[PDB]
């Protein structure tokens, strides 16, 4: 869980 | 630190809390003493860590952002500068806190090429953040400084990783938005973009089942900036 | 403290640069130190101080109800849970005391009109409640006498100065019945007191204000709503 979240995507 | 007479096991436990509890400065800060223990963060603590302090700066940026505007407004009385330089200096203390564990713990030789390539990207976006709100000579150390750390990360990914890896990904929306916004360079930011998007679709049939929902939401955000720049 | 150095005018400005930002604990941070300068709040500035320590507040006692309901969960091994619930705890504590200090120092006077004299009597109710919340035993006891205390005596000036229709004598009777029913253990009050508010607001209904003739309704409602709720 959180990979996406956690890569804080510009 | 004050983290210092807590068991590993615990600060992970009450950053876990603290994450139901929306109290993300207490996060980051549970987390901080977690990675001062000295041990590899798993793949979970790693993004435990991550979400933290993005939750931290990304609520101190979108307040640089209103009172910034406000300033611009008065196109007057000292009050609007003074707020943002106290916010300012929050976001450039929060900055150097991350970039002080990356240095410190977390950045390395060895380990997986995901963790190696997540905490080089990692050290850009905080390098991305001290340059939206610095000037002069700091600006420039901080531009190449970013520029320096997303490069590096994109080497590693390039040679260890398949095109349509989530991380792989993530570091080049990232580091297109950084030609785009930070370095004046929208024809890097694009073609950055467009030969990300290209060669994973050209690789499609490396996309695994684990990447197949995070991907295709990334390969969405490089499509939509390509469709806003062009 | 740290706004000593600082202008009443620019910490008022920068309460309100603070709120459009929503950074709350500076937009009350900027306020206490207006408030430290001595001089009366007007309606705009009490206000301000108000909906500053009211998202403090607001933000920890949600997060404290997150902590406590995971923690009963705990029925079905490890003192994570207690202890964090325990750090959060202590700060909400810590954040009622600075504006019961403030209350109580430089806000609660005998001089002033009845508004700003219940505004800030109904405050240091609210923020005793918010204490009685999260306290035990004796100096739990303590902390209801001294909420409902300071209800009664905002109670006492609004039946004596201001009109039955008047929003803000409403208000108080709301919130005041409220604390009856949820802290207090006493139904036999809140329903009086909710009952007694809207037979003498009705009785007056026909002298009530554009200005003010749709919250005195809209809270009036609500005293009826729960007078139906606990019959
Ligand atoms: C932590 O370490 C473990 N971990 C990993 C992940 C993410 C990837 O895990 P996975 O379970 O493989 O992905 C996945 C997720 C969700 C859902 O539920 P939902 O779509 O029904 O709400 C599914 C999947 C798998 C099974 C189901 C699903 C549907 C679809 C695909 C894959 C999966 C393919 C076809 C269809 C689809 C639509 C869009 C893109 C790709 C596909 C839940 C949990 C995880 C997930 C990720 C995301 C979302 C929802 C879910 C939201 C945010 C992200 C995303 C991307 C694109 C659109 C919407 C979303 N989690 N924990
Ligand atoms: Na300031
Ligand atoms: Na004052
Ligand atoms: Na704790």
Redesign the pocket.
């Known amino acids: 869980?959180?990979?996406?979240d956690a890569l804080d995507l510009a | 630190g004050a983290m210092g007479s807590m068991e590993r096991a615990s600060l992970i436990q009450k950053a876990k809390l603290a994450e139901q509890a929306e109290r993300y400065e207490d996060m980051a800060a549970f987390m901080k003493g977690a990675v001062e223990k000295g041990e590899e963060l798993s793949?979970?603590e790693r993004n435990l860590l991550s979400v933290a302090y993005k939750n931290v700066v990304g609520g101190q940026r979108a307040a640089w952002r209103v009172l910034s505007s406000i300033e611009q407004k008065s196109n007057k009385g000292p009050e609007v500068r003074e707020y943002r330089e106290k916010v300012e200096t929050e976001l450039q203390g929060v900055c150097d806190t991350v970039l002080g564990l990356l240095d410190s713990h977390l950045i390395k030789e060895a380990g997986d090429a995901e963790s190696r390539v997540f905490y080089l990207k990692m050290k850009g976006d905080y390098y991305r953040y001290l340059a939206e709100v610095a000037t002069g000579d700091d600006k420039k150390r901080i531009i190449d400084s970013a520029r320096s750390a997303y490069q590096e990360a994109m080497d590693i990914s390039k040679k260890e990783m398949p095109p349509t890896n989530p991380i792989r990904l993530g570091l080049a929306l990232n580091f297109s938005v950084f030609h785009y916004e930070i370095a004046n360079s929208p024809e890097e930011a694009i073609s950055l973009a467009k030969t990300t998007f290209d060669e994973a679709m050209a690789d499609l049939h490396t996309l695994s089942?684990?990447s197949?929902?995070?991907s295709?939401?990334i390969m969405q955000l490089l499509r939509d900036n390509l469709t806003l720049w062009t």
């Open positions: 869980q959180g990979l996406l | 793949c979970e089942e684990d197949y929902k995070d295709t939401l």
